[model samples]
Target: SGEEDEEILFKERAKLYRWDRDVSQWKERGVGDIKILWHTMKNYYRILMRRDQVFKVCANHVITKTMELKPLNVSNNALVWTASDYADGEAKVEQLAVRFKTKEVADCFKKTFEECQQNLMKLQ
Candidate 1:
């Protein structure tokens, strides 16, 4: 009876649910043996926000470095993210270049990065 009861308990707790983006709501997403593990993984979204430079916004206790955002430029249908470094006081040298899959996606990231840059200036 004890073993049977544990099996029943595990079965009852095995189901999980995650947000379905297509439906715009949370829906049942079944799991295997790691039901408890899935409980904590659903609440976080990572937003990568920088290139190689560490931009400090406050003086208290928070400092985070975003992925190095190099020089960003958009062509007719391509969005390019280039790695850049300052050669001197007035000139910057371009390093590696990356292309995003879509112009809209690239534009979104570019706009967001620019907005963040603007906001950081205001905070400083």
Candidate 2:
């Protein structure tokens, strides 16, 4: 009975924010787990505001560094970890990128690193 009860409890708790057709109102509140996670993962980078400013080309570097060590948390997780992790990282990066404006370094990060053009398209 104890094991069954624990299993039941976990199931109920995990489903608290699962998508619900009738809960359209909750979308505005960003109540989904995906939305919550996306918001959290996009804040770890630098952004550019002016036409002369350069977007950070070192994300590859950062990711490389992140990969060098054991991936114990969300940062090192793959882009589509059950879809939830993807949204979290995507949302966080989009928010920080603020319309993905490229400036001085548009061609700088090419050839050697993951293309923002390709990665950004997947998120859209």
lDDT tens readout by residue for model 2, 1-124: 1122111100000101112246532122121111110112452221111111242121111221121211113322212111111233232221111110132222222211233323444555
> Where in model 1 is the C-alpha error above 4 Å?
1-74, 77-94
Segments of candidate 2 deviating more than 4 angstroms: 1-40, 43-108, 112-114
User: Each model's number of backbone clashes?
Assistant: 6, 4
- TM-score to true structure, per model: 0.30, 0.16
Residue 14 C-alpha lDDT in model 2: 10
Q: Candidate 2: lDDT over CA atoms?
A: 0.20
The best candidate in terms of TM-score: 1
Q: Which candidate is the best by lDDT?
A: 1
lDDT, candidates in the order shown: 0.30, 0.20
